[PDB]
Amino acid sequence: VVKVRPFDVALRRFKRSCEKAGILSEVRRREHYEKPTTVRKRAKAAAQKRHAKKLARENARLY
């Protein structure tokens, strides 16, 4: 929700007011049924990648 208080701002403010309610995110989640197993598999690989990043990104000479 954005009360137009110029329009160009208001539509950008709108576009960021709906990012933040994860609206488009949510529609794309609920377009097709994610089977619960697949949901978890994604979530593990997410966590696993996130860690395996940070770990080696603390191990982060080059030249």
């Binding site: 954005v2 137009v4 329009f7 539509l11 709108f14 007011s17 949510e26 097709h32 049924y33």
Partner: protein, 117 residues
């Protein structure tokens, strides 16, 4: 025609088409226009620009009722979200409020199966 000045634009941006239904504030329809009735078909319906035209076509049919101020209720994930709203500003209409009206179930019905395309 009952002349109305304050109204509501309901943008329905599917991934396929985009519909624009300009109503009074009581949600009685006055005008409607659709990307896939405003010329474009198949691929090109699902573009911002087709939806823009829908909005334009609807706008210049909403002036019969003499509308001036609209609130924009943008409902869905489609390409014709932003473009329709621009096409209402750049068609005179003062936009008061830009609501998102996308239906979000609070876990509800099992969506259709995934496309093994």
């Amino acid at each position: 025609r009952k002349q109305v000045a304050d109204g509501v634009a309901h943008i329905h941006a599917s991934f396929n088409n985009t519909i624009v239904t300009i109503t009074d504030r009581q949600g009685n329809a006055l005008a409607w226009a659709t990307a896939g009735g405003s010329g474009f078909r198949g691929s090109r319906k699902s573009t911002p620009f087709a939806a823009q035209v829908a909005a334009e076509r609807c706008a210049e049919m909403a002036k019969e009722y003499g509308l001036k101020n609209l609130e924009v209720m943008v409902k869905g994930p489609g390409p014709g979200r932003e473009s329709t709203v621009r096409a209402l500003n750049a068609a005179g209409f003062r936009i008061t409020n830009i609501v998102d009206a996308t239906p979000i179930p609070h876990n509800g019905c099992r969506p259709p199966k995934k496309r093994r395309v």
